[PDB]
Ligand binder design. Structure first.
Ligand SMILES: C[C@H](C(=O)O)c1n[nH]c2nc(N)[nH]c(=O)c2c1=O
Ligand SMILES: C[C@H](C(=O)O)c1n[nH]c2nc(N)[nH]c(=O)c2c1=O
Lengths: 249, 252
């Protein structure tokens, strides 16, 4: 199970650490940061600046993708919902459209087909959160298939955070591997999220450990992309989960 | 459901537990390191005076080191206490002073240890150490020492099972055990594991003993999500943090 973008490939045969690059100096404060996270072992960067106008956003997020495409052989993930951004990021060398809104914005769906790139679908918004999020995946995977983006370019993200309380969150985390039925890759972002801040009662700086544990639980069920802030630590932990799932038969 | 019973008190093995490590190699300093682990969540304290090539201590030295420490805890905290020792005197004497778990990494193999672990009606932790299957070899070892114990005074509802992480097992042997670990629940006996800053993290990381925290946290959370009841760590504040999220996914 691989991804294909801008001529290259991503091997989802082992789990993958993606760092976060909120681009909200500036441009140099951005390439410095991505350098480090690549040094840490991030195999994808998640660039993003989000509301704001589509000119503010292009202004910020597009040059940063450019410098990274023309300095490191790392994969590049654009976090945005706007169609201009989708089509311009693709034209510079981005690999994954990452839309938290799931292509919902006017013309974003079509722009995402227009690029031929992998696109990541995340659930957002009766206590069957797993049915709720599965059927949201069953819906959107068809909405995109009608749009003509092949299912083999589709990535699933349950939507940790946002509007879900503690209970719902951890029911998803518990039933993560049940989404493997799609045969589609699973991206997960839980780092420093409130499902760790409430459980551990610590400022946003010190959630590193409850974080790491969410990263391992995900990965032990076969999650393919994990979206974090503390990359060096998550890579190291990801090293020993690969050592574990390789010891199986 | 499982629960461990010693010294007229119990132990809720349903949710996982974090065991700290109190190396005693003074006593003021031991009680201080006890309090901090207790604050950080430690439900058990392992008291220790067991490393390959380390100085052989005497039985006078041991009781000198370890017996005043269990005393200071038993009367100052409500925490459960494990003694890490392999000597019969240290067993009997520490049982007298309010010890809860006997932790013999040499599985009561010293002359008179089995007997001494009988005369004290406390739980004993069995530990495997030392071609076909390292899980097969470990399991047949638990099949053995579970019987030699039962024929001795003690019951099966007193035993703890622990495979042998560290102790010369190579990186795959180590990581294959961590992957078939839930299979040891077939015993229907508590699972205690210890992996903090071991060589399975030291090798696969190419990293010094200090900076194995993240690798260690991971091995704990893999072990916990498979149902290990007790987890032996130096970095306790960090382990109970990770176990809280483990508890949260296991539950909801
Ligand atoms: C704003 C927030 C954050 O960075 O904390 C956030 N932005 N973008 C995201 N994209 C994906 N695929 N999954 C996520 O969880 C996620 C986030 O949580
Ligand atoms: C760090 C040291 C070593 O491996 O040399 C060591 N001492 N005492 C121990 N007791 C239990 N129950 N389990 C263990 O793994 C263990 C150790 O690993």
């Amino acid at each position: 199970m691989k991804l294909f973008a801008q001529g290259t490939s991503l091997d989802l045969s082992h789990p993958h650490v993606m760092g976060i690059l909120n681009v909200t100096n500036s441009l140099i404060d951005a390439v410095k940061h991505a350098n480090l996270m690549i040094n840490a072992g991030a195999t994808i960067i998640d660039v993003g600046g989000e509301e704001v106008s589509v000119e503010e956003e292009l202004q910020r997020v597009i040059p940063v993708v450019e410098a990274i495409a023309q300095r490191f052989e790392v994969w590049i993930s654009v976090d945005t919902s706007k169609p201009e951004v989708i089509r311009e990021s693709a034209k510079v060398g981005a690999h994954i459209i990452n839309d938290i809104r799931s292509l919902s914005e006017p013309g974003a769906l079509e722009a995402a087909a227009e690029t031929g790139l992998p696109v990541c679908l995340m659930h957002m918004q009766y206590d069957d959160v797993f049915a709720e999020v599965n059927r949201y995946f069953i819906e959107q995977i068809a909405r995109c298939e009608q749009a003509g983006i092949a299912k083999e370019k589709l990535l699933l993200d349950p939507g940790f955070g946002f509007g879900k309380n503690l209970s719902h969150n951890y029911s998803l985390l518990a039933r993560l591997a049940e989404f493997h039925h799609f045969n589609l890759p699973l991206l997960v972002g839980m780092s420093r999220k409130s499902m760790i801040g409430q459980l551990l009662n610590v400022g946003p700086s010190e959630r590193l450990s409850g974080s790491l544990a969410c990263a391992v639980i995900a990965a032990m069920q076969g999650a393919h992309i994990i979206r974090v802030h503390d990359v060096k630590e998550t890579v190291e932990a990801m090293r020993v989960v690969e050592a574990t799932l390789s010891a199986k038969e």
